[PDB]
């Protein structure tokens, strides 16, 4: 297809021109094996070995025996594993520095509380500002010309995270299905008290993902909590356990609304219990956030794990520069 032109353009000059020809054949056919491999070898020329590996891994899900994809994948498979371990070791060092401090830190922890709420509600379309959120939570008075539902989403997030820190973070034992339901009972209670802390009774759609049928959610959630308390999950890096825990819940999509908000809270329950600070996926990252969750449905969870790992590093880089 236009892949033949992408190669011709790349053959002597035209790097930025060739980049668009590759994406065009990818838009016109996202399972075009030859375009994925070639794009893979192309992005490796710009030192983007992680993207190249995604492309060879993607091309081998379509055609498992493709010789040009296999030869490059076998090389890059262990290299990307090393590259990803190194990033998690950087994150571990920044967590040591942050967990080796106080009063100057307390001013950041207070600022991040409202800033967390602001992004977790804004990532779903809530129009309230940080200043309007501070008013709602400090004063307990309503903000003019903004809906009551938007302001109740804020009261719920505050209540949910107050319950987690009060009842769940410093608790000894296994995470139950009832703990997930208690978080959701507060996240959504002030908005929809009938559905809050109760599973989906209907079948829905999330982008292009069709989650399990309501008849299967309870069996799928008992399998999820087993996994949270499983020895395999305890041996994973806390950043990887937190990201997978988020993805599996958001995959199950057990509630009508508040699944991303609950998942983002559960994700932070994990991190905090492992000594990491709570992280925040900013409202500007919705496009990336949704792309890497879609990528995980397609077959590759790694881009979402790296997405969470970059979110944790920016959180740690905020606590370290304000010290």
Ligand X SMILES: Nc1ncnc2c1ncn2[C@@H]1O[C@H](COP(=O)(O)OP(=O)(O)OP(=O)(O)O)[C@@H](O)[C@H]1O
Per CB under 6 A, residues contacting ligand X are: 123-124, 206-209, 250-251, 257-261, 263, 290, 293-294, 297
Please say whether the dihedral angle defined by the alpha carbons of residues 243, 245, 251 and 254, taken in this order, is positive or negative. Answer: negative
Cβ distance to Mg ion smaller for residue 250 or 301: 250
Q: 135 labelled as ligand-binding?
A: no
Rg (CA), the chain: 22
Q: 56 labelled as ligand-binding?
A: no
Tell me which of 158, 237, 253, 291 is the catalytic residue. Answer: 253
Which 8-state DSSP code applies to residue 209? B
Q: Taking CB under 5 A as the rule, does residue 257 contact Mg ion?
A: yes
Which 8-state DSSP code applies to residue 167? I
Q: Which of 101, 148, 169, 234 is close enough to bind a second copy by CB under 8 A?
A: 148
Smallest separation (angstroms) from Mg ion to the CB of 259: 8
Q: 65 labelled as ligand-binding?
A: no
Cβ distance to ligand X smaller for residue 26 or 188: 188
Q: 259 labelled as ligand-binding?
A: yes
The CA–CA distances, whole Å, from 238 to 66, 83, 95, 178 equal 35, 17, 12, 22
| Chain residues 152-171 in contact with a second copy, contact rule CB under 8 A | 152, 155-156, 159
253 is catalytic: yes
Q: Pull the structure tokens for residue 112.
A: 């991040």
| CA-closest candidate to residue 121, choices 142, 163, 149, 162 | 149
| CB atoms inside a 10 Å sphere around CB 274 | 14
Smallest separation (angstroms) from a second copy to the CB of 146: 6
66 binds, options a second copy, ligand X, Mg ion, none, Cβ within 5 to 8 A by partner type: none
Q: Which of 114, 118, 190, 251 is close enough to bind a second copy by CB under 8 A?
A: 190
277 binds, options ligand X, Mg ion, a second copy, none, Cβ within 5 to 8 A by partner type: none
Q: 182 labelled as ligand-binding?
A: no
52 within 8 A of 71, measured Cβ to Cβ: no
Cβ distance to Mg ion smaller for residue 54 or 251: 251
| Chain residues 129-168 in contact with Mg ion, contact rule CB under 5 A | none
Q: 31 labelled as ligand-binding?
A: no
Smallest separation (angstroms) from ligand X to the CB of 76: 26
Alpha carbons within 13 angstroms on the beta-carbon side of residue 92 total 9
| CA-closest candidate to residue 277, choices 239, 305, 246, 248 | 239
* Residue with tokens 């399998």, as numbered in its chain: 223
Smallest separation (angstroms) from a second copy to the CB of 222: 24
The string of DSSP letters for 241-298 reads: HHHHHHHHHHHH--SSS-HHHHHHHHHHHHHHHTTPPPP---GGGHHHHHHHHHHHHH
Q: 237 labelled as ligand-binding?
A: no
Smallest separation (angstroms) from Mg ion to the CB of 314: 24
139-143 own/partner pairs: CB under 8 Å, 24+ apart: none
Q: Which of 45, 74, 92, 124 is close enough to bind Mg ion by CB under 5 A?
A: 124
Degrees, nearest 5: CA angle 34-53-63: 40
DSSP-derived 3-state class of residue 206: strand
- Which residue minimizes CB distance to Mg ion? 257
Residue set of the binding site for ATP: 124, 206-209, 257-264, 289-290, 297
| Chain positions contacting a second copy, by CB under 8 A | 136, 140-149, 151-152, 155-156, 159, 185-186, 189-191, 193-194, 196-197
| Chain positions contacting Mg ion, by CB under 5 A | 124, 257
Catalytic residues: 253
Residue set of the binding site: 124, 206-209, 257-264, 289-290, 297
């Amino acid at each position: 297809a236009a892949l033949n032109q992408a190669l011709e353009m790349k053959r002597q000059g035209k790097r930025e021109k060739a980049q668009k020809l590759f994406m065009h054949a990818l838009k016109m056919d996202p399972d075009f094996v030859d375009a994925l491999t070639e794009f893979g070898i192309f992005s490796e020329e710009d030192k983007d070995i992680i993207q190249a590996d995604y492309l060879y891994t993607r091309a081998l899900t379509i055609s498992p025996y493709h010789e040009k994809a296999l030869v490059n994948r076998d090389r890059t498979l262990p290299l990307v594993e090393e590259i990803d371990q190194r990033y998690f070791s950087i994150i571990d060092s920044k967590v040591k520095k942050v967990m080796s401090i106080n009063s100057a830190l307390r001013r950041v922890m207070e600022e991040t509380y409202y800033h967390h709420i602001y992004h977790t509600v804004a990532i779903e379309g809530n129009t309230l500002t940080l200043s309007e959120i501070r008013h709602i939570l400090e004063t307990r008075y309503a903000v003019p010309g903004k809906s009551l539902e938007e302001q109740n989403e804020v009261i719920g997030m505050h209540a949910a995270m107050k319950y987690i820190n009060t009842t769940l973070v410093s608790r000894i034992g296994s995470v139950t299905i009832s703990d997930v339901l208690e978080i959701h009972r507060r996240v959504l209670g002030y908005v929809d008290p009938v559905e809050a802390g109760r599973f989906r009774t209907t079948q829905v759609l999330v982008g292009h993902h069709i989650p399990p049928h309501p008849q299967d959610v309870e069996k799928q959630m008992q399998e999820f909590v087993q996994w949270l308390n499983s020895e395999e999950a305890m041996n994973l890096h806390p950043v990887e356990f937190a990201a997978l825990a988020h993805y599996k819940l958001v995959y199950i999509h057990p509630f009508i609304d508040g699944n991303g908000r609950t998942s983002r809270l559960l994700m932070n329950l994990i991190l905090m219990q492992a000594g990491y600070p709570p992280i925040t996926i900013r409202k500007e990252q919705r496009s990336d956030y949704y792309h890497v969750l879609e990528a995980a449905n397609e077959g590759d969870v790694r881009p979402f794990i790296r997405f969470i790992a970059k979110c944790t590093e920016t959180t740690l880089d905020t606590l370290l520069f304000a010290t």
